């Protein structure tokens, strides 16, 4: 519901049919897939992990080109300092695009946060809670390094979010993954299966909308499929749904019989992916 800016408080569809059916307000979409702003909140709010997230995805048909074919590149991080790099397509060597350092602020009650106060900061103060570069487009990889106040690198295994985006190939393969590979045989417990659409090299293709079909067999039932797309009026109870922005989800529920669950995700012209969920009994 409430699909503002396509909302309507009486009867009748808004814009052409199918009309937006769910909200755009969420940091996370209906399927549980994070939107990019998710990592802004994470850089600001979570003291237990580090954050280094880059937008946009780096394909020519999804980016925006401003003055001088410059693409606005945005980085969400909690780190003290960020170095931004570019790697040409088919290359193994990156070059330094830019480098920016945050300034630490402290309130009277001790709360602390970070704002960018460099010379090319934004004239709108709140936009400096994150970092922005204007980068000319070119096929390849935009990557980032994060540093603490002692100029010590913050390694990738300690950081959440996309520390690199790259020019992908055409859709090649599905990649499925269960969030929990063992669930209770109580007829209630669920397993959430994230399916990604990637090129030959496992890179998520950012605008992929391939129709994915789910085949579930074993000790469980498909109980939902989702992609979080507001205008998508396809049945939640179908066994197939278009991916949206590269991702689609299936939800499977156990039975009251211990066993295993086999789920295969298929799409036309694409290499298929399979997962297996075991269900354990109750004493």
């Amino acid at each position: 519901g409430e699909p503002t800016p396509w909302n309507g408080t009486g009867s009748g569809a808004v814009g052409s049919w199918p009309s937006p059916k769910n909200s755009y307000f969420g940091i996370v979409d209906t399927a549980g897939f994070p939107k990019d702003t998710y990592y802004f909140y994470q850089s600001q709010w979570n003291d237990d992990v580090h954050t280094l997230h880059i937008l946009p995805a780096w394909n020519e048909n999804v980016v925006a080109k401003g003055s001088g074919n410059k693409v606005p590149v945005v980085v969400y991080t909690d780190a003290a300092k960020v170095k931004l790099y570019f790697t040409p397509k088919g290359s193994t060597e990156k070059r330094l695009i830019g480098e920016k350092s945050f300034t630490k602020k402290t309130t009277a009650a001790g709360y602390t946060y970070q704002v960018y106060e460099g010379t090319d900061k934004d004239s709108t103060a709140h936009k400096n809670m994150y970092l922005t570069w204007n980068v000319p487009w070119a096929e390849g990889t935009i990557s980032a390094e994060a540093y603490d106040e002692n100029n010590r690198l913050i390694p990738e295994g300690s950081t959440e979010g996309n520390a690199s985006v790259t020019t992908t190939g055409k859709a090649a393969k599905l990649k499925a993954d269960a969030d929990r590979k063992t669930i209770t045989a109580d007829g209630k417990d669920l397993s959430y299966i994230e399916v990604d659409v990637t090129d030959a090299n496992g890179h998520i293709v950012p605008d992929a909308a391939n129709r994915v079909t789910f085949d579930v067999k074993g000790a469980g039932k498909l109980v939902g499929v989702d992609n979080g797309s507001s205008p998508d009026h396809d049945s939640y109870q179908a066994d197939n749904r278009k991916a949206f922005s590269g991702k689609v989800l299936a939800i499977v529920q156990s039975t009251k019989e211990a066993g295993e669950i086999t789920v295969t995700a298929k799409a036309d012209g694409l290499q298929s992916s399979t997962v297996k969920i075991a269900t354990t009994a109750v004493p």
Binding site: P88, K89, S91, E93, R95, L96, P136, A138
Partner: protein, 301 residues
């Protein structure tokens, strides 16, 4: 007239020698212009180029692709640099859509009332300009060879059936004009084993000539030596590495540039060419390749 006492040899097996001693031609191709001065043949600008090449260890210049300023012949005479003075680029077929180049004048005749002096006037402009050049520099000790063309069959339209005859005629014109020096050219179709290039190389050899091959690698230098044992050869044009000065944030030209510059690392060359270490590696290893003329010594406009 300025003169110097000296003699040379070209052996098909062991290459080039000066005054009885073997010497490896460590050469560069050089266009006429002087950079920010444009085409102005200022003597000091010229002399400075040579001084800078000499410090690189260069000992020979190929005047690509046209007679040099006399000033450049003066400096090498004085500096001890070996000059290969090339007279022509194209022959009687224009290149690259350049309908007003010398390709349209090469075969034209000279008018009776045209009182221009310098060379022989009884045939075509080709002979006039060829003998005019030989006349100016026939005594120049630096000049070791006359080059009569360069990639004559390249970037042209029509059949090439006529080129082995045009070639033999230029060779005859030169042997008659000056007997003390071998004639040569720079041919890029030897590596493609064109019948006409075989025929022309044989005519070169029969007349005490020296065959310059453009853009042969190690593998192609060897076949030339095998299938044509009588030829004495050298790299008339080599490498064509492409680089900007002082650019390091990438090590290859493997990607497409975006700042209109190229890497300064030696991993960048045109598709028909070779990086500097590779074009030299192939030549130094082979006694039968008298030397090399790297394209180019200096950037040109």
């Amino acid at each position: 007239t300025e003169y110097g006492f000296r003699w040379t040899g070209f052996d098909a097996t062991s290459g080039f020698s000066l005054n009885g001693e073997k010497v490896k031609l460590k050469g560069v191709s050089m266009h006429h212009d002087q950079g920010s001065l444009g085409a102005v043949a200022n003597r000091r600008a010229i002399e400075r180029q040579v001084e800078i090449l000499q410090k690189m260890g260069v000992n020979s210049i190929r005047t690509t692709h046209n007679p040099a300023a006399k000033a450049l012949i003066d400096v090498c005479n004085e500096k001890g640099v070996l000059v290969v003075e090339e007279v022509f680029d194209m022959w009687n077929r224009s290149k690259n859509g350049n309908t007003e180049d010398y390709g349209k004048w090469f075969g034209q005749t000279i008018a009776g009332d045209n009182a221009v002096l310098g060379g022989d006037k009884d045939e075509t402009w080709a002979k006039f300009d060829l003998t005019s050049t030989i006349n100016r520099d026939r005594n120049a000790p630096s000049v070791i060879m006359w080059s009569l063309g360069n990639e004559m069959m390249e970037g042209i339209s029509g059949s090439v059936s006529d080129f082995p005859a045009t070639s033999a005629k230029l060779v005859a014109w030169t042997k008659a004009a000056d007997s003390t020096r071998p004639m040569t050219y720079g041919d890029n179709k030897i590596k493609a084993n064109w019948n006409e290039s075989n025929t022309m190389g044989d005519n070169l050899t029969a007349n005490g000539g020296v065959v310059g091959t453009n853009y042969s690698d190690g593998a192609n230098y060897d076949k030339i030596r095998t299938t044509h044992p009588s030829w004495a050869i050298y790299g008339s044009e080599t490498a064509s590495a492409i680089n900007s000065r002082g650019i390091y944030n990438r090590t290859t030209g493997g990607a497409q540039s975006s700042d209109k510059q190229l890497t300064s690392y030696d991993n960048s060359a045109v598709g028909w060419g070779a990086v500097a270490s590779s074009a030299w590696y192939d030549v130094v290893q082979r006694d039968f390749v008298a030397g090399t003329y790297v394209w180019t010594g200096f950037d040109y406009l």
